[PDB]
């Protein structure tokens, strides 16, 4: 069997997803989530498709930046595995 060492495939995905520019979250679940969230502010809202697309790009960019900061925090604590404490520290420093 071509059993790879734990981490090699992770590095391959890291290299592959950094060179691509496609959206990573599935479109329909994100659209459903956006509609559910907007249901709390105003009922029976209609969403333009470009609005959902822009929301998806914004959310993905925000999450990528947050994960970059989280990885920095994880490296700071002499770890390679990110943890919820890392995300909490990153968001606290950013002022969120």
């Amino acid at each position: 069997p071509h059993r790879f060492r734990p981490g090699t495939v992770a590095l391959r995905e890291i290299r592959k997803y950094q060179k691509s520019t496609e959206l990573l979250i599935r479109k329909l679940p994100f659209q459903r989530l956006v509609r559910e969230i907007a249901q709390d502010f105003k009922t029976d809202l209609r969403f333009q498709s470009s609005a959902v697309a822009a929301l998806q790009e914004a959310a993905e960019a925000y999450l990528v930046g947050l994960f970059e900061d989280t990885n920095l925090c994880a490296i700071h604590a002499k770890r390679v595995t990110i943890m919820p404490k890392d995300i909490q520290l990153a968001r606290r420093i950013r002022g969120e």
Binding site: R15, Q18, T21, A54, V64
Partner: protein, 103 residues
């Protein structure tokens, strides 16, 4: 009729920038044509810089067309433009960077 853009040697429209400034001035303010020329020159220079970096990035990738990926690479590859342009480029991706301790 020689246009103000041709008079100032600029590709960008001096008249349109002047009109935009006039309809953006607060409390019936006045705007001089020199301000419009200066602003048009600034916008043209910024366009030229960004397009030069993007064209260099596209040439490095052996393509003849600038895409949002090349714009992202050009913007984040220059410290000054990175500081100036903090917005998110749709479809630009991220600059490939793997931290040293992960290898």
């Amino acid at each position: 009729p020689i246009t103000r853009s041709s008079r100032a040697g600029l590709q960008f429209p001096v008249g349109r920038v002047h009109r935009l400034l006039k309809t953006r001035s607060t409390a019936h303010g006045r705007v001089g044509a020199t301000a419009a020329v200066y602003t048009a020159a600034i916008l043209e220079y910024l366009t030229a810089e960004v397009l030069e970096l993007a064209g260099n990035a596209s040439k490095d990738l052996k393509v003849k067309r600038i895409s949002p990926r090349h714009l992202q690479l050009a913007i984040r590859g220059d410290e000054e433009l990175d500081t100036l342009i903090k917005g998110t480029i749709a479809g630009g991706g991220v600059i490939p960077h793997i931290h040293k301790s992960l290898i």
